[PDB]
């Protein structure tokens, strides 16, 4: 029996593009060799071009009467680590682009809650400390007036 | 000397185990899985193949009547037809013009080549895996073939190994299996004695060389057309052939974890899942006394380059000082980084260089040669290439070190915010207690 | 590139130089024969046509 020709392989980001040139109807199949595979079989009759996923777990394809060929992806990305904080997030979004956004949103929300609570506590403390002196026409205690920025800058 | 480890069930992974006896120099064993083989237990249910219809030549009774006789044959059919007036090449026989009768008979059988081309229906349960492991240490290579259940012990160089039961109980086969030639299908076949015409199992035989046969093929007979001898009949086509043309997929092309399904005996090869516990018992000749080993002090390590690729993409330089030239046993004490070699020649010069493989942005792991220890920290860059033809040589641990750039930024920002909040709370409490003290 | 338009290129019709990139690869002959096996991606001009 004959041996099919080696297809042309073009490497992408978690993908492979195969150019397939048959002399006669030849069977092409592939699978992703992780926990939940991605099956596919087909009878290729004309010169075609296929795109197949290659996750970090790996992949293999069987083309014609040839032996099956296994290919593994590599932890490559486009952000730049060890740089500014806005590039680390790009780096960790290029690979694992589903938990990075969730973690960043959670952290940002937590920081916002903390800063709002702190500012609220300062506001409440200043109101508490200024409400007694504000029921009598009294002096602002320029030593107190300078240290704490209250409503009257220099008026009493 | 008893020792126990846990090593991954992946073929080609360089596992290295560190055995560190208090009175002796540590040694490192290299264990590798050359292949696995997970094989189930099978109970043959029956055998299916193409059928063959047997149609005997008819019995025409001239000037009379005939009566049908029953027989004990699979899917047997017999009938009689009255008023026949058959013909031959030379003339019409059965001289009585209209007082004649034909006996039509037909039944079904197993085909002539059923012992060469047939499908087997099985129930599969209780898988048991073998394995083949290559073990090397000291100056012994050498590969052994073992049963992965804690009930088989092998001796390599006087060391006694038991490879304990697999971590998982996962099998790719379902309860019911159909095997054809070199192909295995997860199928739910009909039981014996309840097959249907036109589908898989229309004829069922208990064994290749059995004598019984159960057939259900919807055979019928019809009247011969006037003036000729042919025994007409109609029947549903074979269910085995329509199964062959439309069985659908397989398990060879579909199984998870990338494990090769083979048959005779049915097995699933190199099917990477789980962990293998290992228990070992070493003689005293394996170890070396602490006197003839080199003694090394003042150990520090620095990384020259790091790039978290699948290969061994990190290089590490390690400096010390030694009294005499010798040989030590290195080991990396975390699975974040995997070293390449297990022994290193130490010389008076005071430098050794080691190659390791990692998969995280910033690893931090402690490395030891002989008795010393040191902490190695690194800043690692992604690879430029997208796709490689070989498997990962690391343990796929991705969480960065707590002292890495990113998570140190996290600490700085969180600490600043926490200090601000603490100051706010302190101001509030001071104000409240001032109000109370009055 | 092999298999596509322009896998072989020439400056003019009568030019003595030629660029070819067709993925021509030799193979091991089978036992007891004299035949020179090889494999090669089909022409890109025919595919373009
Ligand atoms: C433990 O034993 C195994 C098997 O005896 C050793 O592996 C063997 O290593 C040799 C030397 O590299 C290999 O020979 C070479 O193989 C290449 C492959 O293309 C070939 O081109 C060369 O002409 C040469 O034949 C040999 O194939 C290889 N065998 C296996 C089964 O892998 C291993 O090195 C030993 N370990 C130690 C630490 O000594």
Author numbering:
A (entry chain I): 267 to 422
B (entry chain F): 1 to 438
C (entry chain G): 196 to 244
How is this structure described in the published paper?
The Very Low-Density Lipoprotein Receptor (VLDLR) is an entry receptor for the prototypic alphavirus Semliki Forest Virus (SFV). The mature alphavirus virion is approximately 70 nanometers in diameter and has T = 4 icosahedral symmetry. Trimers of E1-E2 heterodimers are organized into 80 trimeric spikes on the virion surface. The LBD is comprised of eight cysteine-rich complement-type repeats, also known as LA domains (LA1 to LA8), which contribute to binding with SFV.
